[PDB]
Short mmCIF file of C-alpha atoms and ligand atoms in Angstrom, two decimals:
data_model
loop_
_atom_site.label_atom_id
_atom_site.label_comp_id
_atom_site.label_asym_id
_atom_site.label_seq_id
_atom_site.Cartn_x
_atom_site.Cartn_y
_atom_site.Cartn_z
CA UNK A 1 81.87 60.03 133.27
CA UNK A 2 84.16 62.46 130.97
CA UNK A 3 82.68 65.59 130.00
CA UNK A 4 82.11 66.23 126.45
CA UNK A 5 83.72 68.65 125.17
CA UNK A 6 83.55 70.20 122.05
CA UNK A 7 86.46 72.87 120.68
CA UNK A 8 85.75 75.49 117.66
CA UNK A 9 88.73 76.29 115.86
CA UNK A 10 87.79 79.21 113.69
CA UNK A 11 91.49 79.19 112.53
CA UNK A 12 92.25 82.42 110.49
CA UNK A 13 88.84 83.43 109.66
CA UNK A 14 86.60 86.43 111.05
CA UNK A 15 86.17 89.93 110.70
CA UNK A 16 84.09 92.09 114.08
CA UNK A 17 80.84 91.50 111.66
CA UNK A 18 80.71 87.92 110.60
CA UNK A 19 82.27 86.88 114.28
CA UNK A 20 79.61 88.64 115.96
CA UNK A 21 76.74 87.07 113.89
CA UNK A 22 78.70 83.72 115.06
CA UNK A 23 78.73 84.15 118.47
CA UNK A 24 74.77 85.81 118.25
CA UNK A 25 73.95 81.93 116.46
CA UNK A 26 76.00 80.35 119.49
CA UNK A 27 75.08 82.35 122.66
CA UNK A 28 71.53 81.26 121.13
CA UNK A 29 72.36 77.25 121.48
CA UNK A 30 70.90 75.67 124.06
CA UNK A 31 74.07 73.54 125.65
CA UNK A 32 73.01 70.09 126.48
CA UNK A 33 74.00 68.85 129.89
CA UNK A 34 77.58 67.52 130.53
CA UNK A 35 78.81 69.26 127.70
CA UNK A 36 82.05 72.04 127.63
CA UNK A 37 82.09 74.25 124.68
CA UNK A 38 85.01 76.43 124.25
CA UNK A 39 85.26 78.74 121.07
CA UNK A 40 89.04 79.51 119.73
CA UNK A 41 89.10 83.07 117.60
CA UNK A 42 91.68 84.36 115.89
CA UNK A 43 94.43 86.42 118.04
CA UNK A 44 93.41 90.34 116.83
CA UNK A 45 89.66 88.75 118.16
CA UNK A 46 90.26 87.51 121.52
CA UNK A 47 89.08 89.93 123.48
CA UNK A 48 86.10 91.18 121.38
CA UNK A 49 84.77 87.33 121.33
CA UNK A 50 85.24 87.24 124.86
CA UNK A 51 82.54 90.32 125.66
CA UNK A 52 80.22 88.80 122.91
CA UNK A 53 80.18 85.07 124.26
CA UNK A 54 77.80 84.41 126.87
CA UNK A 55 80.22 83.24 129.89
CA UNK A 56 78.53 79.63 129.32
CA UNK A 57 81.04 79.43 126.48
CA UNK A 58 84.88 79.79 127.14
CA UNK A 59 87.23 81.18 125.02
CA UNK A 60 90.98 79.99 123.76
CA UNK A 61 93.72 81.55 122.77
CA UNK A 62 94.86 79.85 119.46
CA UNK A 63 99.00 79.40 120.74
CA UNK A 64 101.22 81.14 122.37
CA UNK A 65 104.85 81.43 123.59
CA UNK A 66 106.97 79.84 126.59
CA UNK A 67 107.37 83.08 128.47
CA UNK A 68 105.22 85.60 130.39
CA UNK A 69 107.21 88.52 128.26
CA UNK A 70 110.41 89.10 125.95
CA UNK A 71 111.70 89.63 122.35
CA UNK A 72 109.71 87.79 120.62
CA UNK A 73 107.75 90.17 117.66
CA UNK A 74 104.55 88.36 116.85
CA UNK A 75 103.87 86.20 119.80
CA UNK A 76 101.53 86.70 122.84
CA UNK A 77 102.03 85.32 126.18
CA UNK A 78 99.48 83.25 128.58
CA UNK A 79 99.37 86.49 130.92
CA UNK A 80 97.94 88.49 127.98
CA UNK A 81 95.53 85.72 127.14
CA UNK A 82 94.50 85.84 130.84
CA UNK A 83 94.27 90.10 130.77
CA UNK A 84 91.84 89.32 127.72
CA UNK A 85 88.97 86.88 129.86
CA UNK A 86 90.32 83.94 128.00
CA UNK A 87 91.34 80.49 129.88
CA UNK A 88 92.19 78.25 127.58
CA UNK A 89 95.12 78.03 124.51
CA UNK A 90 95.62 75.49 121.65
CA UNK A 91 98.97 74.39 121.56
CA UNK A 92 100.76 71.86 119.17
CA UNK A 93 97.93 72.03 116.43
CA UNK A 94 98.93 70.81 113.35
CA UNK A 95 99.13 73.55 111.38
CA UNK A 96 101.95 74.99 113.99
CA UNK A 97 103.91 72.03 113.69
CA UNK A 98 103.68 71.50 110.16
CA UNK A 99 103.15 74.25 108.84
CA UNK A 100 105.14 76.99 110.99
CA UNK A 101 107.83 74.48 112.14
CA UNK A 102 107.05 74.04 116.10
CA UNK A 103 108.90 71.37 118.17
CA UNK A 104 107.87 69.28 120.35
CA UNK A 105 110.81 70.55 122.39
CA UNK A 106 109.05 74.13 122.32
CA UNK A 107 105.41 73.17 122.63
CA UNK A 108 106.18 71.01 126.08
CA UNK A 109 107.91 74.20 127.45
CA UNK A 110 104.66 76.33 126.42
CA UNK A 111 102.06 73.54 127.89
CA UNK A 112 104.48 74.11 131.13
CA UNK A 113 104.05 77.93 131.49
CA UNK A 114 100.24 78.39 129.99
CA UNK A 115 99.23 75.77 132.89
CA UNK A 116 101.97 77.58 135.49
CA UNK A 117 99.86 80.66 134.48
CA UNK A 118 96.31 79.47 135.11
CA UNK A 119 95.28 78.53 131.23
CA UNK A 120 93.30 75.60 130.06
CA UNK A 121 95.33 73.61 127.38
CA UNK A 122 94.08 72.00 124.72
CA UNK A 123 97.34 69.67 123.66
CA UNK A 124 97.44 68.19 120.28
CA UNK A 125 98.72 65.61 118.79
CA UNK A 126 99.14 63.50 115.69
CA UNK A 127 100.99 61.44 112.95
CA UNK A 128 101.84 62.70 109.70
CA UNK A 129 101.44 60.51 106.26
CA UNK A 130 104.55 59.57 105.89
CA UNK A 131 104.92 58.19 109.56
CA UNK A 132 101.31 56.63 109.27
CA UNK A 133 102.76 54.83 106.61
CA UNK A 134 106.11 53.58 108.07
CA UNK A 135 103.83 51.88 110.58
CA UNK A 136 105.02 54.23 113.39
CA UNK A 137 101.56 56.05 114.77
CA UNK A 138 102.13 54.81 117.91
CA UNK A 139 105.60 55.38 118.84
CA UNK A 140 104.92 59.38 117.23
CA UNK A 141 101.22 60.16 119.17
CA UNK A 142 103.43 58.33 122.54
CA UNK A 143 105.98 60.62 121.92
CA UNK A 144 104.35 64.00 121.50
CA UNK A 145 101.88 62.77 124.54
CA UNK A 146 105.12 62.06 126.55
CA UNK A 147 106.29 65.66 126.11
CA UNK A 148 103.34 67.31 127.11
CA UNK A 149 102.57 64.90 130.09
CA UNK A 150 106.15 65.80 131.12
CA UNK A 151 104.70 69.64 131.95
CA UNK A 152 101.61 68.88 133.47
CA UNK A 153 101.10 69.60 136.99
CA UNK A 154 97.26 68.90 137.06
CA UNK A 155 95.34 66.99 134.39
CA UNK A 156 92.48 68.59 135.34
CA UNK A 157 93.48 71.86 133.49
CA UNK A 158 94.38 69.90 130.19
CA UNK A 159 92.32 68.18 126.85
CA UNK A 160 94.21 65.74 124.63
CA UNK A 161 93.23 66.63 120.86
CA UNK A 162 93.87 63.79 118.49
CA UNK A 163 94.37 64.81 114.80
CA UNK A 164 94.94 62.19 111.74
CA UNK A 165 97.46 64.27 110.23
CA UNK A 166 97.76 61.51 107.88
CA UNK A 167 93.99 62.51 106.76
CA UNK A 168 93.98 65.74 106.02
CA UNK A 169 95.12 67.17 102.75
CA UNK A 170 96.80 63.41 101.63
CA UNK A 171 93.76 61.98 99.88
CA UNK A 172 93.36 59.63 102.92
CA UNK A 173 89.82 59.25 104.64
CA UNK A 174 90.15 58.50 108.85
CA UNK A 175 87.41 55.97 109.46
CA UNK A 176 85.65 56.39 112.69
CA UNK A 177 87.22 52.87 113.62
CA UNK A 178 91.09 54.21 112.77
CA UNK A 179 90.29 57.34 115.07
CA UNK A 180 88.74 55.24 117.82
CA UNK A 181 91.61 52.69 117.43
CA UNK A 182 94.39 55.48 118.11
CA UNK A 183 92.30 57.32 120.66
CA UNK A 184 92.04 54.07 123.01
CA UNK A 185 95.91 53.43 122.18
CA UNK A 186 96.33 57.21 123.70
CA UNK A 187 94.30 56.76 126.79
CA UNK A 188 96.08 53.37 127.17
CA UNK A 189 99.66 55.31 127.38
CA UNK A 190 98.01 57.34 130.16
CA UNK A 191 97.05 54.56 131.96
CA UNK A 192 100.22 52.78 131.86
CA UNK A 193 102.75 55.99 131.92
CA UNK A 194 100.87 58.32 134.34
CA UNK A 195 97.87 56.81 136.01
CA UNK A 196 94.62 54.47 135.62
CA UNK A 197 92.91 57.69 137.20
CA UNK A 198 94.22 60.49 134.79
CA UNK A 199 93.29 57.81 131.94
CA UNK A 200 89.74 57.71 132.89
CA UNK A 201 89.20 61.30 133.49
CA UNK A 202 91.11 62.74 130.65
CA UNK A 203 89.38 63.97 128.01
CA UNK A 204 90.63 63.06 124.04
CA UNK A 205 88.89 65.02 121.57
CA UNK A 206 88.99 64.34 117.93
CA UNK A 207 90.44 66.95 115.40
CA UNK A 208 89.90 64.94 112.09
CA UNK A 209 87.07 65.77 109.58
CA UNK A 210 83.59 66.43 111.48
CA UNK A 211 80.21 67.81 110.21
CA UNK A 212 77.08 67.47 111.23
CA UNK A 213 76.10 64.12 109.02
CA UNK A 214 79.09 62.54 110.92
CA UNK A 215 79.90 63.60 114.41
CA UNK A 216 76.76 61.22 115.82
CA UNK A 217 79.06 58.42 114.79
CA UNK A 218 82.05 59.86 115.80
CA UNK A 219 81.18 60.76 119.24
CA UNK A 220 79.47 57.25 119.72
CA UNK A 221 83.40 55.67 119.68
CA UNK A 222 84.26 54.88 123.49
CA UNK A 223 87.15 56.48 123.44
CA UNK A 224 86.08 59.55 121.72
CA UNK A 225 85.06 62.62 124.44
CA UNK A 226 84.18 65.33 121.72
CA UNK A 227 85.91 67.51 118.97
CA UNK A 228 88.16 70.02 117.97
CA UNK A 229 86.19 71.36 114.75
CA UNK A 230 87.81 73.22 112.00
CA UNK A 231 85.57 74.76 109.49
CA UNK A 232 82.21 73.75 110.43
CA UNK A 233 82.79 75.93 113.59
CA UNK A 234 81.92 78.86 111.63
CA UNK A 235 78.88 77.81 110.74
CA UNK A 236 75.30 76.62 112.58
CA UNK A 237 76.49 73.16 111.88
CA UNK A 238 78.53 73.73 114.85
CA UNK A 239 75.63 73.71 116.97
CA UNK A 240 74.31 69.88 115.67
CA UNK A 241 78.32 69.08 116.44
CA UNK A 242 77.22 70.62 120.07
CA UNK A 243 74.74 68.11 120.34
CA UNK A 244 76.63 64.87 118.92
CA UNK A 245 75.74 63.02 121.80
CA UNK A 246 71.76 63.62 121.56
CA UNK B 1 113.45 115.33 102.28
CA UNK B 2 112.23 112.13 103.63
CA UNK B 3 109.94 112.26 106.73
CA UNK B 4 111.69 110.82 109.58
CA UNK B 5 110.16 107.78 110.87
CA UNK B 6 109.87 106.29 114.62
CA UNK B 7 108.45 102.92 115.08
CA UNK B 8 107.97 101.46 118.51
CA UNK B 9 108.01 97.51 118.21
CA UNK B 10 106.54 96.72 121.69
CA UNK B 11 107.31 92.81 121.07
CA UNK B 12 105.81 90.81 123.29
CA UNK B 13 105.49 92.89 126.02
CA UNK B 14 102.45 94.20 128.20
CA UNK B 15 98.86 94.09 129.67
CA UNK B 16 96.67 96.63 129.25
CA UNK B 17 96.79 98.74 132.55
CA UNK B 18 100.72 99.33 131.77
CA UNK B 19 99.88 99.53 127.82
CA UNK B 20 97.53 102.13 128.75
CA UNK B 21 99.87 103.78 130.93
CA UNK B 22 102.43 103.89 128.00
CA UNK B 23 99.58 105.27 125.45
CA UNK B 24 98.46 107.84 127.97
CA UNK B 25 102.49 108.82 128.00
CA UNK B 26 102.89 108.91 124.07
CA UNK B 27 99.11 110.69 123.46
CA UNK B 28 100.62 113.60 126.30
CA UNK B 29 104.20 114.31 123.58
CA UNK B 30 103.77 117.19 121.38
CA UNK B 31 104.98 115.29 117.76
CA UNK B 32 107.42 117.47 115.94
CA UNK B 33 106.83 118.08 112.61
CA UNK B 34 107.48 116.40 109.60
CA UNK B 35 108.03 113.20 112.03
CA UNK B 36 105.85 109.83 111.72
CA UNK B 37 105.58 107.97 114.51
CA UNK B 38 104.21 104.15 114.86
CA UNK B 39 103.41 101.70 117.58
CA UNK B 40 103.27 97.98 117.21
CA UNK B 41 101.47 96.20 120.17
CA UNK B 42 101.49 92.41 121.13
CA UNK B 43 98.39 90.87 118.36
CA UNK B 44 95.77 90.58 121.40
CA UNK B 45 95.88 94.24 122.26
CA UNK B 46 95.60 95.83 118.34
CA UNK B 47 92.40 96.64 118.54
CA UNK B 48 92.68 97.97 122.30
CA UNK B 49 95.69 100.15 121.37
CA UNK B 50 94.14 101.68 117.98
CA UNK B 51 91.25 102.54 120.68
CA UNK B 52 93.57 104.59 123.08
CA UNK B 53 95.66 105.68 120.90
CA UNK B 54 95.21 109.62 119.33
CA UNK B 55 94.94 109.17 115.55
CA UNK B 56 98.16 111.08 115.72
CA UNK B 57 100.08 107.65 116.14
CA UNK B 58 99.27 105.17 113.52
CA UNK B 59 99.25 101.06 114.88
CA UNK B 60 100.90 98.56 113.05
CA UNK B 61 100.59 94.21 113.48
CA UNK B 62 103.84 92.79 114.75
CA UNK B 63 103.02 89.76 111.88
CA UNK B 64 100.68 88.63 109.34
CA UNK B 65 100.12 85.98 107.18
CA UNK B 66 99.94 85.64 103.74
CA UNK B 67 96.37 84.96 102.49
CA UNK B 68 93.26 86.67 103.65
CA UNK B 69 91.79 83.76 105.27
CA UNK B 70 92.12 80.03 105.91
CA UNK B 71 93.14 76.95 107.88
CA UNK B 72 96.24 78.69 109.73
CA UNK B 73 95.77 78.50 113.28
CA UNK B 74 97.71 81.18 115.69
CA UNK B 75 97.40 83.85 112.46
CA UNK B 76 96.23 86.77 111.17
CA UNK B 77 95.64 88.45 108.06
CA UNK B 78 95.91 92.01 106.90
CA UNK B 79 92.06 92.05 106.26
CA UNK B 80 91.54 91.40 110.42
CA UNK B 81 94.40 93.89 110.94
CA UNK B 82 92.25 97.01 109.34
CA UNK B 83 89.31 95.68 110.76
CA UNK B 84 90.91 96.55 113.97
CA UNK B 85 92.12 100.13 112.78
CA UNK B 86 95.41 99.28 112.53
CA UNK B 87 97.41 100.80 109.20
CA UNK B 88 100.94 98.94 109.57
CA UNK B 89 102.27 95.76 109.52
CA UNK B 90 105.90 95.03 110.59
CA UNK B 91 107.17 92.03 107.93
CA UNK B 92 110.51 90.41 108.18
CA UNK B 93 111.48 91.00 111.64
CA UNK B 94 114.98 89.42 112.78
CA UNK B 95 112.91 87.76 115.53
CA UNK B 96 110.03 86.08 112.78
CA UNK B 97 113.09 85.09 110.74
CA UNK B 98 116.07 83.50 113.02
CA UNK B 99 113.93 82.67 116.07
CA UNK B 100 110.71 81.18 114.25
CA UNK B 101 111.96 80.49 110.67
CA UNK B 102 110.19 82.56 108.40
CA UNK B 103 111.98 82.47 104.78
CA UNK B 104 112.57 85.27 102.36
CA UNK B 105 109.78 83.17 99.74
CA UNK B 106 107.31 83.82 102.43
CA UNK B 107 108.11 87.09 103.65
CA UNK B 108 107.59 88.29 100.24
CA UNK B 109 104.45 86.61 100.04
CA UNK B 110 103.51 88.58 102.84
CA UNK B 111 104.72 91.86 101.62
CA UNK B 112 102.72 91.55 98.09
CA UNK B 113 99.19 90.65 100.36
CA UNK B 114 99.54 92.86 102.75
CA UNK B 115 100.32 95.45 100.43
CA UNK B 116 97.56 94.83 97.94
CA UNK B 117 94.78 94.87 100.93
CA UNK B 118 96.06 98.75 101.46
CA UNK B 119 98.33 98.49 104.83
CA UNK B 120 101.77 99.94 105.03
CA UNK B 121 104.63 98.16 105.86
CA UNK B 122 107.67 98.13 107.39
CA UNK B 123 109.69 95.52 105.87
CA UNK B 124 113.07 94.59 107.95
CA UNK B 125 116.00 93.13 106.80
CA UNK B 126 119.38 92.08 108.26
CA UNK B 127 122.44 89.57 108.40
CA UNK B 128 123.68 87.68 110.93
CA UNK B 129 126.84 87.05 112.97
CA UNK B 130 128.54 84.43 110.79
CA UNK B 131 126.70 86.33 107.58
CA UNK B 132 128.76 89.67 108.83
CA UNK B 133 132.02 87.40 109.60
CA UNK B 134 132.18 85.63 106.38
CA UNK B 135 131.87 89.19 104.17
CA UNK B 136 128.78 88.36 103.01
CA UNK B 137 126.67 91.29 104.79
CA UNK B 138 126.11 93.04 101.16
CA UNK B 139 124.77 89.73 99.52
CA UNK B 140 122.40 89.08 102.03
CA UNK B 141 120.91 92.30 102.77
CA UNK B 142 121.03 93.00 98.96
CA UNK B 143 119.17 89.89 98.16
CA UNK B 144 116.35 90.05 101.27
CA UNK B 145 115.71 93.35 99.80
CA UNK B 146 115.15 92.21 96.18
CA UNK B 147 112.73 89.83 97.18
CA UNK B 148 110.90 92.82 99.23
CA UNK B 149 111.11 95.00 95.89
CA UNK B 150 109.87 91.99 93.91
CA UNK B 151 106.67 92.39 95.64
CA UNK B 152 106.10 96.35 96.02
CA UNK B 153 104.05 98.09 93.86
CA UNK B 154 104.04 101.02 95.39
CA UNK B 155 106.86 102.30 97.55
CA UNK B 156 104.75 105.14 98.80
CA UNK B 157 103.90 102.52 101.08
CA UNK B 158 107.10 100.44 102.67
CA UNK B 159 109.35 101.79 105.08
CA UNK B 160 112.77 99.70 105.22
CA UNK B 161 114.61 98.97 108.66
CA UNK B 162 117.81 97.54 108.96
CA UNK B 163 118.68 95.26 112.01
CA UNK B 164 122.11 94.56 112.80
CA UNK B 165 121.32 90.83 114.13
CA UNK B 166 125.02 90.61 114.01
CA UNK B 167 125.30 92.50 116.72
CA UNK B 168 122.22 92.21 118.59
CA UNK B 169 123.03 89.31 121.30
CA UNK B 170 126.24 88.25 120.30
CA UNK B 171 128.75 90.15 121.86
CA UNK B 172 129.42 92.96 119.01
CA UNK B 173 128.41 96.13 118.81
CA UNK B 174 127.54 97.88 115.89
CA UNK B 175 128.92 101.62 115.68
CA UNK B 176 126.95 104.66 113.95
CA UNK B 177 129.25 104.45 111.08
CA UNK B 178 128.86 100.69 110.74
CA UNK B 179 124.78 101.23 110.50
CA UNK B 180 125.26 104.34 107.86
CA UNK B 181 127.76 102.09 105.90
CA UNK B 182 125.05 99.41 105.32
CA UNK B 183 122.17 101.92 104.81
CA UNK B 184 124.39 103.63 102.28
CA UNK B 185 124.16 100.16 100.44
CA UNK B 186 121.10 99.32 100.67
CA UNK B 187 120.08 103.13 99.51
CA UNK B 188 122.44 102.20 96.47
CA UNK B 189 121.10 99.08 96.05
CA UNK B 190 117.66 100.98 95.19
CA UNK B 191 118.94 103.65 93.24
CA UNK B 192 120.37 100.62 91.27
CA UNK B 193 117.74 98.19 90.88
CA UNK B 194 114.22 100.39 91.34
CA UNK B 195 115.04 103.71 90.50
CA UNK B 196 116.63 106.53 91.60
CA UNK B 197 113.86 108.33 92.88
CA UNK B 198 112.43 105.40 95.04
CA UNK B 199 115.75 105.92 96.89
CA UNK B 200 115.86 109.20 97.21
CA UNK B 201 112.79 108.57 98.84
CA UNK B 202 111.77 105.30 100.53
CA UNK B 203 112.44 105.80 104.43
CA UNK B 204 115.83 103.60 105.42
CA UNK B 205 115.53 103.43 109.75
CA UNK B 206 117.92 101.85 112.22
CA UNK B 207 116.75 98.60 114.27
CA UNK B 208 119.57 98.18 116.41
CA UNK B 209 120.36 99.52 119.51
CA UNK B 210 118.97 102.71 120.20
CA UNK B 211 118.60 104.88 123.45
CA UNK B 212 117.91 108.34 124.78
CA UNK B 213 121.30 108.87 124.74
CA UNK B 214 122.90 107.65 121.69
CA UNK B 215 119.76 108.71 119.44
CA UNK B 216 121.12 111.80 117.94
CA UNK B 217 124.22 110.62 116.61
CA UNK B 218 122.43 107.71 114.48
CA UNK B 219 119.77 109.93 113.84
CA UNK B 220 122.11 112.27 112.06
CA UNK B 221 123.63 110.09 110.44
CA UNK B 222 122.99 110.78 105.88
CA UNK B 223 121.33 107.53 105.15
CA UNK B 224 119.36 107.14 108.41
CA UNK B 225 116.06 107.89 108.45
CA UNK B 226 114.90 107.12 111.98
CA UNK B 227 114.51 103.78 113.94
CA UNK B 228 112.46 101.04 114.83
CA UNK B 229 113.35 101.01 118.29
CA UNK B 230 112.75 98.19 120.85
CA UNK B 231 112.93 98.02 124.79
CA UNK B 232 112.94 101.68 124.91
CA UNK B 233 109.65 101.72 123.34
CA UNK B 234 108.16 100.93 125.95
CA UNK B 235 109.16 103.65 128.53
CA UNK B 236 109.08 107.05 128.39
CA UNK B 237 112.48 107.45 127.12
CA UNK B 238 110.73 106.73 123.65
CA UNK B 239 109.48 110.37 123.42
CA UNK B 240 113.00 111.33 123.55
CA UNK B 241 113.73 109.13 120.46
CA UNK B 242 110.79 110.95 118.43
CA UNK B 243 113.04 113.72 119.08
CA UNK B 244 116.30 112.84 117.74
CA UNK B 245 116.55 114.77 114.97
CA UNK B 246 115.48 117.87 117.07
O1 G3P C 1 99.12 70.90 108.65
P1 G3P C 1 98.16 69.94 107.99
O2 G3P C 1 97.18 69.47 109.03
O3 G3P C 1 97.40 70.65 106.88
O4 G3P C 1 99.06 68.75 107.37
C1 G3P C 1 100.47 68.91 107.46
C2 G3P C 1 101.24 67.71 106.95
O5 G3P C 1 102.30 67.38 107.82
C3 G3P C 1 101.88 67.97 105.59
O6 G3P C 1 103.28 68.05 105.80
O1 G3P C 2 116.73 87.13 116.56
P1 G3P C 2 117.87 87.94 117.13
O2 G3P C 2 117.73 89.36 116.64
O3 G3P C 2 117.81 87.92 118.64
O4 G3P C 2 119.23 87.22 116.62
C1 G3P C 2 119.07 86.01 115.90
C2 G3P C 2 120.39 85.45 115.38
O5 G3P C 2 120.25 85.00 114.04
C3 G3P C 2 120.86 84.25 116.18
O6 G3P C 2 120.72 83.11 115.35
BR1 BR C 3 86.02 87.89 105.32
BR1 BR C 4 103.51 92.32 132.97
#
């Protein structure tokens, strides 16, 4: 069976203080069986997260760029991620395509070189409002999955991240049933466009609203394998999220 | 007279066994006086170069964001930037704005919060090749530096550097009379607009090309006020640039 696997996206939050009082509530967890728990800090943090977390917890880079160095002010590569003890990066989250304007030309060519380099990837994708509402989920989520399938060498190295988009910051509530519903769509494009194999084995994570009243639910959807968490990854709800499927 | 100012914009470039090679290199050169020098490292290695690096050399961020914290996944804020000892943030760069989008709106955005949380900042500015062709290069530099002003309280604390994008990968080259013409300008423009005294003196340095060998002739140039170098920053030709003016 699939590994859960539960991602913490603390997004831009964290100072040394706070972060370390985190990680002191998380290298305290007890991690259930069958269960991957990898811990995203923000960039200046990487490598002081890294010496804090107990090795049972791995650590991702939040993005990075195509290239292993170059003129590019701002951006870090998958070698320096690598130099810092991480192994695994978030790329295509929602907030860099929507917010900071990333392709899914561009995030294809940096799910190519993070797994040429040795990372983990986390690959997400989603729908926006607008294309929820034209009826076009599908042909969107098939799309972006298409472009990061197209630079993977190894599905064992990479996590599919759904996130309803269309559900955060529109008003909208995702049901458990709506994420299950696209999730199973997903894993059906793997099955018919790579491999019955890789659909079995590939983790799809859900990046929607979670908390601890809810992710017991959540994880019981077939097609659900575990979370990417926002803000309740900051907090010791992160741990009952841990243990959704207890 | 205005300090002269050397910036070394490592972009993304190194891991720390060659970034502590290059600190070792820059702690070892004897600073002349009245001269401020600045290193920005990739975001993953702040915290390691404010570490290695003799107080003698401030570190600035490459990029920032614009809020202290929040749901914006691959940044950082100015508050995790002085939590890793860093004192600069480079805003603006050519690279942020024509390879990664960033608009004026939110570069200002970015000026006013990282200002207000106590960081300097080097705020860049610059027009590009069909900017430069159509005439325009006065307009555009005039009116990205307005929207920096807009959002300075106190110019004790920006340092401005002009990048000749025009002629950075295109095929031009910019002279050393070309780069004193526009910092002439923009030196006008402040005299103008803020006050005479903030011209007389807010720091004005050179961001295009700049080597061992062609650093005294820009450096003596009226209106420039040192650089913010690139490639060279990271060799040991850099020290050389520290010393233009000598
Ligand atoms: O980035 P989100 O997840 O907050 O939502 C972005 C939507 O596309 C709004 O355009
Ligand atoms: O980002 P540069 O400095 O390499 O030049 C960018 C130009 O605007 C090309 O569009
Ligand atoms: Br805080
Ligand atoms: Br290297």
């Amino acid at each position: 069976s699939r590994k859960f696997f539960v991602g913490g996206n603390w997004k831009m939050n964290g100072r040394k203080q706070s972060l370390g009082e985190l990680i002191g509530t998380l290298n305290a967890a007890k991690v259930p069986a069958d269960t991957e728990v990898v811990c995203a800090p923000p960039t200046a943090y990487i490598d002081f997260a890294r010496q804090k977390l107990d090795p049972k917890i791995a650590v991702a880079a939040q993005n990075c760029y195509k290239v292993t160095n170059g003129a590019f002010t701002g951006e870090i590569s998958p070698g320096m991620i690598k130099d810092c003890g991480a192994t695994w990066v978030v790329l295509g989250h929602s907030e860099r395509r929507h917010v900071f304007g990333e392709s899914d030309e561009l995030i294809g060519q940096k799910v190519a070189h993070a797994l040429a380099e040795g990372l983990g990837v986390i690959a997400c994708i989603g729908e926006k409002l607008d294309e929820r509402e034209a009826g076009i989920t599908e042909k969107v989520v098939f799309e972006q999955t298409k472009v990061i399938a197209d630079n993977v060498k190894d599905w064992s190295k990479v996590v599919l991240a759904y996130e309803p988009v269309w559900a955060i910051g529109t008003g909208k509530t995702a049901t458990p049933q709506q994420a299950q519903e696209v999730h199973e769509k997903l894993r059906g494009w793997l099955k018919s466009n790579v491999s019955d194999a890789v659909a079995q084995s590939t983790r799809i994570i859900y990046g929607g609203s979670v908390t601890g009243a809810t992710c017991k639910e959540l994880a019981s959807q077939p097609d659900v394998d575990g979370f990417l968490v926002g803000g309740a990854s900051l907090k010791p709800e992160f741990v009952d999220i841990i243990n959704a499927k207890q």
